[PDB]
Every structure is written in structure tokens, then in C-alpha cells.
Design a protein around this nucleic acid. Structure first.
Lengths: 78, 95, 90, 104, 92, 96, 78, 95
DNA sequence: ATCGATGTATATATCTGACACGTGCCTGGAGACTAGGGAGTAATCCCCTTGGCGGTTAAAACGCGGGGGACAGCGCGTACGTGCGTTTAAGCGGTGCTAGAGCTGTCTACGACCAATTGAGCGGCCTCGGCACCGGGATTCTGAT
DNA sequence: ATCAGAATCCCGGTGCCGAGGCCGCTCAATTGGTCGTAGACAGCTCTAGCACCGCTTAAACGCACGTACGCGCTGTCCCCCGCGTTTTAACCGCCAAGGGGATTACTCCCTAGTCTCCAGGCACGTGTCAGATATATACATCGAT
């Protein structure tokens, strides 16, 4: 399902980032970067979820799992 | 010159750039590995919070890697620039 | 319990004709809570370093001068030292 | 009994002193919390709230809107330099990145 | 009297390597390392018990703080060491 | 001795007192200092074993903080745990 | 008196960092980044010192200032 | 090739590369501006702790800036590389 | 690139739904009193920091020369943006089930809290051996040929 | 490949000083025992997450093509490293004063704790108006006919 992050979506993220031209090897490297980021956030969110006696990963578990990593996310945990 | 119009349009809008359903299936696919094969439920705002965080991380990594690209004397991004920005930002800021 | 009433009161004091959306109010609640946890945890470890048990107004003033940048840490401690000196008059 | 004057009213504030006193007490920051610390804390939070709400109202008046959406909060935070150092590690949900198409 | 972790770092050092020793400065490094990791694990368990509306740091918050803070292989061995010590302590 | 009961070498009484007087939470359980001292003892054993190997590779029978830096920066995971720390009197790991 | 951070000392720091060749404009910017680092850490250590009733910047004040700014230092305080 | 012998000799050792007395005068000159005119005393271990921290910060910044230098197709370190290492290093880990 | 087509700010027109004002209610905050210990505050001892001087001697500085490398110019040729036809999967909008979050109510193990007692751990003190430095062997790299 | 000539470790003395073992003492951890409450735990309600179907339809995709740009080469020319002689300020070792850290002892006053009211803030409910599109009008703004 990592190929569901399509090449127009990666190109849209890069054009939001200000990137003028993009090589064809960015798309297989941005998918790996997204894999590593989502593994690092989802492992902490599943750790918080398993610490509580719940089987549903809530919204606050993602916000706490990001404030763990130092990247705070405003807008869901208040 | 459609890159200038596209960058000028995408730097104003606030909507999510990755579509919501294949990001949801990607998050399910990654989440089922850390739960030792059992499947978890996700709140509707949990996937949206994860998608906001992932897209903001991706656009910040892309503007850092484009600073690296313009440092190298070019305009095309090569994955060596993203790989270099991941290790100049550090071990938990770039990873 | 949230900070929606006070953010709206402050907003109607500062900009009397503007309003705030619901998602921006969630941003403001999360912002007030995150700055609260940062300042309170910094004053907590300030009281823990000096072997003290009380978070006074000196601990909050030092945590404000540590966490905030130079321009804000000279205005925020003015607001705090005007509010406490108003409050003690009672 | 005398009429119940709230502690955020005598300090000339708008953020609550009693609620931030309960949050400092039940927050495990210290085993004892002084009296002037919730007044100081609420004044600092009320100043920082009015400081990003003024710039958010300015960016909403610049976008010809009479309502603040979190895009204007991002345009308020990322433009002022002190608030960009205070909120450097903060991601604003549904907020577009500040327009910087660099002139190289 | 100023309490430190110098004696236990020496006991663990003798157990792992019975012929080496530590200098004064590298005992200060280890005595500050134990204090730093203790502060990190206990603060993470503190905010973890604050999230779930609990008042007790039991072994679940310590184990989950170890799983949160540490990397992949160190977490899988450290929770095994902790669970072995808790089982050995409660079996007494 | 409570520490001896758990089969550890790090103290469980001092760790329990630092958890109680450290303001972390209103109450601290019984097995939380046992678990905490076991994790601290394992991490201290890991970094001291790597530092002892790095000191024995330099043919020294004593650990100086150069060996602790060569233990941290050569190991992959202790470099992720101790990434934002600075070992005093520890030279940078050789590279070019 | 930041010119006491001499040109061979900046060269020694760069050679410890692995730098093979150093331009002549590095020495006036290394004495700017070092001044910015010191004007952050010394400001926080003076704040920690003045919070207590002290006139001596101890080793603990520097260690706590550095731990506040994210760069933990070991072997001096603890 | 004296730069290689100098790099290996400096990477083997652990001694402070900046001299203690001019760094101490720099630290006191910077400190007297923040203490509202009245001079402060510095402990003997405080100046060494600050000098170890500043030395480790400058060596790590020169490693990152030399990675950017080798990215740009150069071997000469240029102040634009140190500026870009501080810029993509962040607002917290840089400066 | 002298105007013509082409994207782009005004401007009124719906229209939806989300903000904001109002009400009822409840629990959390304010008032008043007690009461115990934490911190303010003086008094004092003694560390340790600053300041000074004098020699030394290692490192900094100045200058010169040469060769490495930065950088601009240019050409080949690959690969990326763009356009257009085709196809496909995301999104809406309904619907229906049920797993699980969330709340309440009981009760029991569990951890704070006292006292008494003593062994673990800290400060100090002394010895001895690891390490820093040095001195020739023995080898092992480095520019010039 | 060959040179003579610096450049690196490897055995043996010498010595300093700091680690490590040992001892006295004292305070913090261990042991019993109480007792109040937080959390385990069953029971139940009901939200919202998952799953499905059907239809749009906007976005993804395949293919081709022109051309912008990556990248390798080359040629001036700056300017950084190395070397040799000065030269200067860091550093070590004494020495002496005294400011201020750190501890103790008294003591007030501030803040936890409790009980009682009751007003601030939250949940719910509903009008109405800000804003998202929509579509013809007017206005800059250039690229391809």
C-alpha cells in the first residue's frame, strides 16, 4: 500500500515545499522516509494505546506520540 | 512555467495533499506489524492527525532538501539531498 | 474543561470585531496547555534544583525568562509583575 | 459572607487563577504551590494568548476575513520572530506552510 | 553526605569485567548517565500516569516508559531484565 | 535488603526514595523501583561492557571517558539513546 | 576580546571535525557562532544563578542551562 | 600531507583545543552583559564545562558543514556551508 | 514584441452550516478558620575564587612562495515537465451491525504513614600499581628520481 | 620499482598521584502494623468505527516529445597550506586576601486542609450571517502565434 502514496502526491508535497524540479528517484525515497516516519509514530501510538486497556488508537495517542518525538501537533488534543 | 503557478497555488491552500484512503490503508499496514498480528481500530481524527504530521514533516524535509539542492548548484532534487538533510537534522529530527 | 471562554474574552478585548473558528479555538486551547506544561515543568525543576518545595512567583518568573525569547521575556514578566502586584493589594 | 470576587478579577486578568491553581496543584509539579504563582502564570498565559491573537486578527484582516482560521494562526506564528522561536517545534493542523518561493 | 551511584556502577563493572576499573571522571560520566536515564524514564512514566488519570507509578508505567524511550533491541532486553527482577522480587 | 531480593546490584530503596521525593506521581508502587533499578542496571551493564571492551582494545586496564565515547558512538542503539549528550573529555570517533 | 579565539584554534577545531581545507572567511564566522552559543548558554546560566541567591556561576548552572537547551553534558554535574 | 596527520592526531586526543584563558576572558566578557553590570564569579569547573560544551558544539558543526561542503563538490569549507548547517540544523539545535 | 488572447482580482448571488448568544444546571472555586512546617533572615566558618608576580616556553603571528582548487565557460545527452487520451480508485451518500470506549458501583489488595533499629554507604586516609613520559631498537612509510 | 630520510610502535626504566581498599560512624532503608482509598473488575449503555453497495468523476497514469539542465572537461587565477623565523601571551608555580557559598538556629507567615455555599463555566439548543462557490465584468500581463 506504500505505492498508494502516488507520484502526484509526492510531487504536490514537494511543490508545497518550494521544489522546482524533482528527479524520478525521489518517489522511491520519499516512500521510504514516510515508512520510517510512520513506523516511528505508530510504534509510540500503539505503545500508548496498549498501555491503556484499549484496542482503539485514539487521536490523543497520536498527539502524545508526536510530543514524545519532540514535534508537537496542535489541534487535536484540546 | 506551470511550476510557478503550481507552487504559488499549493503554498496558499491548507488541504491535505496525500489522499486520505491510501494513507489510511498505509497506516493500517504499518500498525498491524507492531501489534503482533492483531488488528487495532483507529479513530477518525487519529488518521487525520497522523496525516497532518506526516505531510508537514514531508514538506519541511522537502524545503530543507531543496536548500541542499540549491547549495549543490542545481535545481532538481536528488535523493542524496534528502539523505543528507536527514543526517544534518540529526538522529530524531531528520529520522 | 477547556480555555475557550478565556481565549474568546481575550480575543474580544484585543480585536473587538473579529471572531475565531472552532479549529482555531482548538489550536488556542492546545497552545495555552502546551505553554502551561512547559512553564510549569521548568518551574518544577527550578524548585527541585534548589531543594525547595514551593513554586512561588519567583520560580514562574525565572521559568518565563528561561523559556521565552528575549523580547517576550521582558514583556511577560512585566505583565506578571504587574498582575501579582495588583493581586496582593486585594 | 462577603460577595465572591474571583481571583482573576482582582488581578485584572481574563485567564482563570483558580483553575490554573488547581492545575498547578494537581499537576505534580511540586508538593506545594504558592499564592502568587497562579496569578503570575495566568498573566503570562493571557499575555501570550493576546500576543498571538493580535497577529492572528491582523492576518485575518489582511485576508479580508472577519473570522480566524488556523491558517491565520500559522501566518501569525511564522511571521513574528519571537513566536517562531517559541513555537519552532510546533505543527499547526490544517495550516499551510508560509509562502517562501526563494528567488534562486 | 552527598549520595551518588558510584558504588553500584563499580559493582556492575566488576561483574561484567572483573579486571578493569574506572577513573574518577568516567565514574562521573556513569553517575550522571544513570541520573539522566532515571530522570527520563521516571518523567515519561509520570506524564504517562497523568494521561491515563492514574495516580500510581506501577510497573506498567515503568515498562511502557522503557518501551517508549529505548530503541528496539535495548527495549526488548531491558523489559526482560525488568520483568525478571519483578518476578524474582515478588516470588520472595 | 530489598535490592538483594530482586537479584540486582542497583539499589531499590534509593530508587524508591527518588521516585517518591521526585514529585513524579502521588503514589509509587512496589515493583516500580524494582523494574526501574533493573533497567538502570542493565543499561549500565551494557555501556560498561562496551566501554571495557573499548578500553581493552586500547590495551588499558582502566576506563577513561574516551572509552565511554568509543562505546556509545560505535554502538548503533546507544548512539540513539545518547545522541543529544556530550561526554566530557571524550574525543570524536575517528572518521574522514 | 573574541580575537583570543585564535586562527590556529579554529583550525584545530575544524581539523578535529575532519575539515581538510578551511577558507579565510571561516574564522570571522566561527567567532560569531561561538559568540551566539555562549550568549545563549551564559544567559541561561546567569538566569539559573540569579534565581538562587548567588553571585557565582557554578558548574551546575552551566550543566542545567545546557540540559535546558537540549544538549546534555555529562561528567561535571550529577 | 600534513592535514591528514593533523586530523588523525587531533581525533586521537581529547584535550581542549581552545586555550583556557582567552576563552575564560570571552566567557566573562559575555557574562558581564547579562548580570546587570555587577560582575559575577565563575567556578573552576564552570569554565571547563562551558569550554567542553562549546568545543563539542564547534566540532559537531564543523562535521555537518563539511558534509555540506563535500555535497557542493568542494573540499574547502566556506562560511555559506556553516550558515546552511545552522539553517537546516534548526532553530533549536543550531545557533 | 508596436497588440490580442489569457489568467486574475471585484462583485453580486445564492446557500449551507458553523459560530455565537441564550438558558439550565452542577461542580469547582471562593470565603473563613486552623495549624504546622518551609522558607526568610541573621550570624559565622571556612572554602575557593580572584588577583598578583615572575619566569619559561609552547604556541601564535608575519611573510613568502607555490601548487591545489574554486569557479566560470561550454558541449553532449539524459531525463523531467507538459500535454492529452484513457482508466481507475478515492470520495460521497446512505445503511446496518457490533466491537469497544466510557461510565457506574463494589470491594479488596496496596501503598502511604509512623516508630525502632541497624547495616549499607559516605567521608576520610593511606598505599601501590596503572599510566604518562622518556629512551633507544626495529621497522615502515614518503617525496624526489 | 629505488632511494635515503623522516615517521610510527615496542620493549624497558622512572616516577607521580589517583584509584581502590579499609575503617568509623550515622542516617536512611528495612521491618511490623494500620488504614484509608485508588484501581481491578464485573455489568451495562450507546457511540462511532468498520464494512458494504452503488454511482460519480476528479485524479492518477501511460505515452510521447521538446528542451532545460546535470555533468564531465578545461583554463585562468586566487588564495590556503607549509615553512621558517620572531614574539608574545598562556601557563605553571607561589602566595595572600577576602567575598561569598554553605551550614545552623530561630521564627513567622504562608499554604495545605476542611467545610460551606453559590456563581462561573459547561452541555445543549437554536437563529443568522460569514464564507465557499458561481459566474459574468473589468483589469493587468505577458508569451505564441
Amino acid at each position: 500500500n506504500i505505492q498508494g502514496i502516488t507520484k502526484p502526491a509526492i510531487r504536490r508535497l514537494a511543490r508545497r515545499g518550494g521544489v522546482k524540479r524533482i528527479s524520478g528517484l525521489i518517489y522511491e525515497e520519499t516512500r521510504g522516509v514516510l515508512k520510517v516516519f510512520l513506523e516511528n509514530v505508530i510504534r509510540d501510538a500503539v505503545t500508548y494505546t496498549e498501555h491503556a486497556k484499549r484496542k482503539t488508537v485514539t487521536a490523543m495517542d497520536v498527539v502524545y506520540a508526536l510530543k514524545r518525538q519532540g514535534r508537537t501537533l496542535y489541534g487535536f488534543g484540546g | 512555467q506551470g511550476w510557478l503557478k503550481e507552487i504559488r497555488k499549493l503554498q496558499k491552500s491548507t488541504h491535505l495533499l496525500i489522499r486520505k484512503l491510501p494513507f489510511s490503508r498505509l497506516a493500517r499496514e504499518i500498525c498491524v506489524k507492531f501489534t503482533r498480528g492483531v488488528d487495532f481500530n483507529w479513530q477518525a481524527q487519529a488518521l487525520l492527525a497522523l496525516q497532518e504530521a506526516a505531510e508537514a514533516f514531508l514538506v519541511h524535509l522537502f524545503e530543507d532538501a531543496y536548500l541542499l539542492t540549491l547549495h549543490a548548484g542545481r535545481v532538481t532534487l536528488f535523493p542524496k539531498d534528502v539523505q543528507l538533510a536527514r543526517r544534518i537534522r540529526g538522529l530524531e529530527e531528520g529520522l | 474543561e477547556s480555555y475557550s471562554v478565556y481565549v474568546y474574552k481575550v480575543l474580544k478585548q484585543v480585536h473587538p470585531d473579529t471572531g475565531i473558528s472552532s479549529k482555531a479555538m482548538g489550536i488556542m486551547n492546545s497552545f495555552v496547555n502546551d505553554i502551561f506544561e512547559r512553564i510549569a515543568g521548568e518551574a518544577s525543576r527550578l524548585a527541585h534544583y534548589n531543594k525547595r518545595s514551593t513554586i512561588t512567583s519567583r520560580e514562574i518568573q525565572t521559568a518565563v525568562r528561561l523559556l521565552l525569547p528575549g523580547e517576550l521575556a521582558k514583556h511577560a514578566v512585566s505583565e506578571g509583575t504587574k498582575a501579582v502586584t495588583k493581586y496582593t493589594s486585594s | 459572607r462577603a460577595k465572591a470576587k474571583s481571583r482573576s478579577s482582582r488581578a485584572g486578568l481574563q485567564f482563570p487563577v483558580g483553575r490554573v491553581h488547581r492545575l498547578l496543584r494537581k499537576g505534580n509539579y511540586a508538593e506545594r504551590v504558592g499564592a502568587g504563582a497562579p496569578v503570575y502564570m495566568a498573566a503570562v498565559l493571557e499575555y501570550l494568548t493576546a500576543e498571538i491573537l493580535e497577529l492572528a486578527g491582523n492576518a485575518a484582516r489582511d485576508n479580508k476575513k472577519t473570522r480566524i482560521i488556523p491558517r491565520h494562526l500559522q501566518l501569525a506564528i511564522r511571521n513574528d520572530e519571537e513566536l517562531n522561536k517559541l513555537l519552532g517545534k510546533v505543527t499547526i493542523a490544517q495550516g499551510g506552510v508560509l509562502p517562501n518561493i526563494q528567488a534562486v
